[PDB]
């Protein structure tokens, strides 16, 4: 992430990391439940074979808490399209169940009707990940998190040189140099409500990072609440 | 402002009007408290809670 602080012991439990053959974190993820991980569909094309790591805050220095789980099933959204990134979401089924502890916990999934009206109308939300700290910089090895204010839909669509479908939403800053970036993709965007956090988005893309006039484009998770439950049902 | 439109109708989590009256609910991992407004963590690690 560009700016923000590093996640302190326990702050970002629902954070998940996608590692390829060479055990590298290319994307992010959100812990839905012991057997389920939420992520962006576009990430699925970033690796030929990958696994998931959880409860990690320093890629280069094991904290004894990490845990690597093999992906058993990949449930992508058949309507996703690289051409527009519309329907940029995916759910992953783990071979083995996760074990919740200090930095390994799941984010809560809300109710579309409630979410859209309560959560989504909050002041800001929080995104996190081991993404690049600068647009053209390199991947971070410290799990990071940043508080991104919500952006008006109109302002959003308008500020983007790309088609902002209804499965997307802006979050981030107009000019301030704080915004997610590559590597946080598929990462978690959550919204606190009375000290409880709900998965509200999925790091998707942006016309660069932190750029003035450009925001962060996330996958509006409420639109797939129904789709996510079903993907879990089987 | 009115009902759930007012301070989430006093629910800890999910609120949803229905016949002039509020109804509270919680995500899975939490069980509705006596007052029917708060949400009690069932397991040790309910979702949405930082681990300190
Ligand atoms: C690394 C990086 C550096 C410099 C420029 C870009 C840049 C351009 N242009 C993008 C990017 O996404 N491009 C998209 C690809 C999908 N198309 C679709 C509509 C066809 C729109 C442009 N990334 C990579 C990047 C950017 C991010 C995020 C930034 C803020 C977030 Cl929230 S997520 O994550 N990875 C960039
Ligand atoms: Ca480590």
Alpha-carbon span A82 to A42, nearest angstrom: 7
How far B19 CA sits from the closest chain A CA (Å)?
Answer: 17
Q: How many CA atoms lie within 13 A of A55 on its CB side?
A: 19
Alpha-carbon span A213 to A174, nearest angstrom: 5
**Could you tell me where the beta strands, DSSP code E, fall in chain A?**
5-6, 15-19, 25-33, 36-39, 51-54, 67-76, 90-94, 124-129, 144-149, 168-171, 188-192, 197-205, 216-219
Alpha-carbon span A101 to A173, nearest angstrom: 33
Whole-number Cα distances in Å, A162 to A63, A123, A155, A198, B44: 41, 25, 13, 28, 44
A36 touches chain B (CB under 8 A): no
- How was this entry determined? X-ray
Greatest pairwise CA separation for chain B in angstroms: 39
The residue written with tokens 């309560």 in the block is A118
CATH number for region A13-106+223-234 = 2.40.10.10
Kindly state the tokens that stand for A163. 């088609």
**Comparing C-alpha atoms, which of B28, B24, B27, B7 is closest to residue B15?**
B24
The residue written with tokens 């200090």 in the block is A102
Q: A111 vs B14: CB contact, 8 Å cut-off?
A: yes
- What residues does ligand 1 touch, defined as CB less than 6 Å away? A 84-85, 135, 162, 179-182, 185, 203-209, 216-218
Please say whether the beta carbons of A36 and A94 come within 8 A. yes
Could you give the number of structural domains in chain B?
1
Domain of residue B23, residue span: 1-52
Provide the pairing of β-strand A90-94 with A36-39: antiparallel
Active site residue A69: no
**Could you tell me where the beta strands, DSSP code E, fall in B1-52?**
14-15, 24-25, 30-32, 39-41
Q: Does domain A1-12+107-222 have CATH number 2.40.10.10?
A: yes
Domain A1-12+107-222 and domain A13-106+223-234 have a common topology = yes
CATH number at residue B41: 2.10.25.10
CA A12 to chain centre: 12
Buried b (16+ CB within 10 A) or exposed e, B9-37: bebbbbbbeeeeebbbbbbebbebeeeeb
Whole-number Cα distances in Å, A45 to A88, A158, B6: 12, 28, 45
Whole-number Cα distances in Å, A69 to A23, A26, A35, A73, A92: 12, 16, 10, 12, 11
Candidate from B13, B14, B47 with C-beta closest to A105 = B47
Pocket test for ligand 1, best of A200, A206, A210, A213 (most atoms within 8 A of CB): A206
Domain ranges of chain A: 1-12+107-222, 13-106+223-234
**Comparing C-alpha atoms, which of A30, A25, A55, A50 is closest to residue A40?**
A30
Q: B30: helix, coil or strand?
A: strand
How far A6 CA sits from the closest chain B CA (Å)?
Answer: 14
Distance from Cα A182 to the centre of ligand 1, integer Å: 7
Alpha-carbon span A88 to A66, nearest angstrom: 27
A195 touches chain B (CB under 8 A): yes
Alpha-carbon span A160 to A214, nearest angstrom: 7
Q: How many CA atoms lie within 13 A of A105 on its CB side?
A: 24
The residue written with tokens 């609440």 in the block is A225
Please say whether the beta carbons of A183 and A27 come within 8 A. yes
Q: What are phi and psi of A218, to 5 degrees?
A: -115, 160
Chain B residues lying within 8 Å of A114, measured CB to CB: 14-16
Q: For chain A, what's the residue count? A: 234
Whole-number Cα distances in Å, B50 to A47, A106, A215: 30, 9, 27
């Amino acid at each position: 992430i560009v700016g923000g602080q590093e996640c302190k012991d326990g702050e970002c439990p629902w954070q998940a990391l996608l590692i390829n053959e060479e055990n590298e974190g290319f994307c992010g993820g959100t812990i839905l439940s012991e057997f389920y991980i939420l992520t962006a569909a576009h990430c699925l094309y970033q690796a030929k074979r990958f696994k998931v790591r959880v409860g990690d805050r320093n890629t280069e220095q094991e904290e004894g808490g990490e845990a690597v789980h093999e992906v058993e099933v990949v449930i992508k959204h058949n309507r996703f399209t690289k051409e527009t990134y519309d329907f940029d979401i995916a759910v992953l089924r783990l071979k083995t169940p996760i074990t919740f502890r200090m930095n390994v916990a799941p984010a809560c999934l809300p109710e579309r009707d409630w979410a859209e009206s309560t959560l989504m109308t909050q002041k800001t939300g929080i995104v996190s990940g081991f993404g690049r700290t600068h647009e053209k910089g390199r991947q971070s090895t410290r799990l990071k998190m940043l508080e991104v204010p919500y952006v008006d839909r109109n302002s959003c669509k308008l500020s983007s040189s790309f088609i902002i479908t209804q499965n997307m939403f802006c979050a981030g800053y107009d000019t301030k140099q704080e915004d997610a970036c590559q590597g946080d993709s598929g990462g978690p965007h959550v919204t606190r409500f009375k000290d409880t956090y709900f998965v509200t988005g999925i790091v998707s893309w942006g016309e660069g990072c932190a750029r003035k006039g450009k925001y962060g484009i996330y996958t509006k998770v409420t639109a797939f609440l129904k789709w996510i439950d079903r993907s879990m049902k089987t | 402002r009115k009902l759930c439109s007012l301070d989430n109708g006093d629910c800890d989590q999910f609120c949803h009007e229905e016949q002039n009256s509020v109804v509270c609910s919680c995500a899975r991992g939490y069980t509705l408290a006596d007052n029917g407004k708060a949400c009690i963590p069932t397991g040790p690690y309910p979702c949405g809670k930082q681990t300190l």
